[model samples]
Target chain A: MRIDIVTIFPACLDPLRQSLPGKAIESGLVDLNVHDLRRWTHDVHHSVDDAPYGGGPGMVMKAPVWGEALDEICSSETLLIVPTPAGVLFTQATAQRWTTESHLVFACGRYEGIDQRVVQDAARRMRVEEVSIGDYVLPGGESAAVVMVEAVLRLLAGVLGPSYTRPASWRGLDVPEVLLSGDHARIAAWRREVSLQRTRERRPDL
Target chain B: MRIDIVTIFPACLDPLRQSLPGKAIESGLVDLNVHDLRRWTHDVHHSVDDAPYGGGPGMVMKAPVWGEALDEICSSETLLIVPTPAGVLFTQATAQRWTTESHLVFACGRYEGIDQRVVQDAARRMRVEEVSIGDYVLPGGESAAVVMVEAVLRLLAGVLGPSYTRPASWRGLDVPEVLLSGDHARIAAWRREVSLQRTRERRPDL
Candidate 1:
């Protein structure tokens, strides 16, 4: 798997260098790249935010820089993931689906998020998916991108040892007790039950 | 606001000291504390995890250390937030609710998460609330807690200036044109529409 994350703070991706996912990178199961979004800014100050035309408190992330950054990083087959509070809620099923993709490019936005035009234009060229880790907003999308990479990377084949695989079980909220039983049929039933229960409790409309 | 976070890696909280949130801390609008969970461990080796009763691949965080840590840090009105994959899905509404609290204590767990016994026990003595940023696995809860603190703290009464709260909108998952229209009513309506549209599309359950 190949993952490219575009963010103003490259250091935010440093944690992945020290944990299980880091080991996955070392073993050649994954390739992780962090690109500085500011590199695309041409202004003397490398400005990346501008005032909203209608007038707002916070600045909106500039569109030109993001457009340039996306053009340089994305490929025809890349899975473009945008992290925002106002995007699709992420899920394990989503992570499982992303594991099958060969490449992923994350557009990390800050301030009031990237200009809408840049995101929409990029969507036309790549498999774009806007995802929200949850309802709250962070200073930037670095953390959300981190969450995305880790969640998807862990599920890739060969990343975890055999012992680590089957032992993994859902816990809390919608997690069912059948997982504790270790029976194959019962475990599947429990997983389905828990998944549905979780979706209902947290994301009823989904 | 004062926030104390208990986690294993003190270094994980370093990013908080570098951004806008850091400025808030320096300005006295926020007081941040990072405590190593191991400090509360009674064992000479400073162990903080143990095998589950039914057995599992990864270690489950020990309850004793967590219990001791909370007992020492929590006040009568402190809001104890636990970051876990299974907790209540965190939202901006939740962040807004938390911003009104006097103090916050965040428990960052690793492995299979802190022992259920510890969380249950702590609930009896403090205002405990389990919160999951999203439906994904983190190496541990420290980073997530950092994300949570930054989001909630910035929304506090005085942390962000009025200029930071602007009305903007998006359209059909795209950025809203009214944001650039220079019309207040249009901007407000656009914001509500975009917010609702984004929420419905991404988190239909919300």
Candidate 2:
């Protein structure tokens, strides 16, 4: 899969270069690119935002900047993902389905948001999805991009398992005996049982 | 407020240093710290994870390393947060309340997850919360930490509004007439109307 992210704060997305996303890029499972939305700006100040049209608190990302950037990057195979608080909530299912796409372009909106027209117009040419990572508002969509990208890439790679090592006990805490027993069947069963119990106790909503 | 993040991939939280969180830190609204979990390890390989006890696919984070890190960082006044898929869903209300906390320690788990004992033990000493950003899972908690930290900081500072600017029209798209009319009352009304409409159209769940 190919992933492209456009944000005014390209630095916010730098973590993608170091973790699982970075590994996937190096391993050739993903082709990832980060673009500065400001690069497409034609003005001397390279401004990408202005006062909202209908008099709001924050500036809205100009349609032109996003327009030019998306025009040059998106293709018939692309899916434009706009991360926002107002959009549909992202879920494991959303990440699963996105893994099948050949390319994904994430437009990270800062300030109030992108001009609504940008999303409306782009939908005429390609699939544009506006997704929210959660109910909480964010300063920008860069972190959400990092999260959604990781979610999708992990699905593609099937990266599995968490690990632990020696020092069986520490600070009066002991590794569960079943884990150390080396009884694969029992261990698996124990894991399943505890996981169920954990869900019931901590997340009854689940 | 002060914030401390524990993660194997510190780079994932780098974005926090560049945007709203960065400004908050610079202005002394937040004193932030990111620690590499490996630094707390004692082995030659400096390993912080090992095979799960009950035979799972991934490794579980060791309790000792986390124990030492938290012992040194956490205080009676600190609130320990662990970001995971199994925790309570984070929301705007969650962010609003967290702004009142003076210190936060976020433990970013990777591989499968941190040893359950780690969280269980910490709760005996300070307030501990295990929060899920949304329904989807990611490679680790760094991005979620970035999201949560930004969410909380924006509230503390009362960061308001998005911005946009001129070129009354661009590429066949014109700024809404009401916005340009400069009728503050009408503009405000139009914004409110559109905002409510947007919520209804895109997110009836709200």
Candidate 3:
């Protein structure tokens, strides 16, 4: 998959280079673009934020800068994912659904958020969904984007090793003992049982 | 606040040096320690994982190495937080609760997970809990730990600047018009309205 991240603090995203994201890009499995939202600014200082219309202590991100950025970066196949506290919950299942898409655009909002209008405008040309990694409020969406990207990529073939695909003992927990009986029938039965158990435990909301 | 992370992949954590975490450590605002769990291994190869007793495809983290690592890293004040898929959700409120903690130790598990007994045992010495940043599985807990540390530290006073506390417009979305009026009463009222509105929009499940 291809992911483009737009954020004011491009430096903060450097940590992603030391993790799976860095390796994924190098392996030709993903094309990742990290950009300074300020690059879209037309001004000398390249201002990306402004005072709120309704009067509030925090600055709101300007629309036009993000508008131009998205217009240039996004394509018809793009899925615009904006991370915010107000967004719908993101889960493994959600990551699974997005795996089929070819491109994902992560609009990392800093300060308050980007112009919601820009988000709506992006929707006209491509898919747009607001997603939250968790119920927590974050300083920005960069970390969340790093997280969701890893989550999605790891699910694809060759991204993770056998260690991730199989279960093992961790102290007081073990796979159903039947898993080790060395028989096709018992192990297969246990695998199906664990599958049901995993779905129930991990995604009852589904 | 003090944070300690025990993971095998210490090198991947370097990117954090370029972000707020690096600043937090440099300013002496936080004491951050990253250690390899294998440092506690007694074997020549310093192995940290083994095949499960009941037989499984993936490896299980050995009990003794983690115990020794925790023994050296943990203190009475250390709130031991382990990230896993079967754990409780982490949220902004979770970060709020952690702000009061003086020490936090993140025991990041690879393979399947840490010995469940280790988690139960840790609770006997200090505060212990299992947390999930979101309902997804990753190769390990390092990313989740990174996400969570930023969230909690940003909430502590002096971590965020004025821009974080104030609100502003971001297209198609505005603070209540009453906010710009600058009347103390109107501002307070809008704050309350948004509090309820945000809760309703974000946590209808609650």
Candidate 4:
């Protein structure tokens, strides 16, 4: 898969290169690119933010800069995602869904956020998903972008295989020793029960 | 505040020292420390993982090594957090609640996960909260830790102030112009209404 991240704080995302995302890039499992949102700015000062349309404390990102960057980096096939506080929850199910996608473009907004119109306009051009990592807010979306990349790519081919599929039960303790008895059907049943029981014990919401 | 993170990927968190977390450390707002989990291992090979007690393709983090790290790093006042899929959601509320805490210790689990025994043992010594940054699963909890630190710390004293608290309504548009009108009563009313409206629209679950 290919992922492009557009942000003003590119250095903030430098951590991705040292972790699992870095491994994904090195192994050719993904082609990840980071671009400066300022590159799309159209001013002598290379500014990309401005006061809100009417009034607000922090500046709202101007539409032009982000629109231009989105236009240049995204396409109809791209999953164009913007990380914000007011967005859909990002979950394991969400990451699993993206495994089928070929390209993803993340627009990491700063300040109060990109002008709302930018998202409205880009929605017509690509598959846009406004997503939040969690309920908390960060200075910007760079950290969220790093998180999304790692979460989505880890389940890709050669990234993480189903290693925990074995019967976790052993006869002496936690998982029973029946797993060691070599009863294939019983083993599968035991594994399923263990998985369900573990889930229930730790996460009743699941 | 003091924060200690014990993980196998010590270099993975190096970017924090250069970014906002780094700034917090430099300014003495936080005493952030990252330690290698293998340091607690007794073997000359520095191995800290083992095959599952039952049987599995992937390795599980050994309890002894993790227990040692927790023993040395955590205390009665420490909020022991383990990043995992079954944990509670990390939210603005969670971050705000943590501000009252003086110390936090994050144990980043890798592979299948840390041995469940380690968590059970540590829970007896400190306040333990298993939290998921989101529903997604990455290769490890390192990325989640990064997301959490940024989210939580940004809400503390020096990070974000009331700068963005201006009336967000500009006229009938996005943020109301009443915010800029400078009527204290009206501003407070608008802020409360906006906050409620935003929470309802973006996070009904909250």
TM-scores of all models?
A: 0.80, 0.90, 0.81, 0.82
TM-score sort, best first: 2, 4, 3, 1
The worst-scoring run of ten residues by lDDT in candidate 2 chain A lies at A159-168
Better of 1 and 3 by DockQ: 3
Candidate 3 chain B: 10-residue stretch with minimal lDDT:
B159-168
Per-residue error (Å), model 4, residue A27: 2.2
lDDT tens digits by residue: candidate 2, A100-126: 899999999988889877887688789
Question: Looking at model 1 chain B, which ten-residue stretch has the lowest summed lDDT?
Answer: B161-170
Q: Tens-digit lDDT track for model 1 on B76-100?
A: 7888888877677787889888888
Query: lDDT of candidate 1 vs native?
Result: 0.73
Kindly list the per-residue Cα lDDT of model 3 for residues A3-65, writing each as its tens digit: 888888776666556656677778877888899888788888888887755455567777778
Q: Higher-lDDT candidate among 1 and 3?
A: 3
Candidate 4: residue A153 Cα off by (Å): 0.6
User: With candidate 2 superimposed using the best TM-score fit, by how many Å does residue B90's alpha carbon deviate from the native?
Assistant: 1.5
Which regions of candidate 3 deviate over 4 angstroms?
A158-206, B158-203
Model 4: CA > 4 A from native: A42-44, A158-204, B158-206
Question: Candidate 3 residues B79-129, lDDT tens each?
Answer: 999988776778788999998899999999887777555775577789998
TM-score of chain A of 3: 0.77
Stretches of candidate 1 exceeding 4 Å from the true structure:
A157-206, B42-44, B157-203
| Model 3 residue A200 lDDT score | 77
> Per-prediction DockQ scores?
0.29, 0.56, 0.35, 0.36
Model with the higher TM-score, candidate 1 or 3: 3
- Predictions ranked by DockQ, top down? 2, 4, 3, 1
Error of 3 at B151 (Å): 1.4
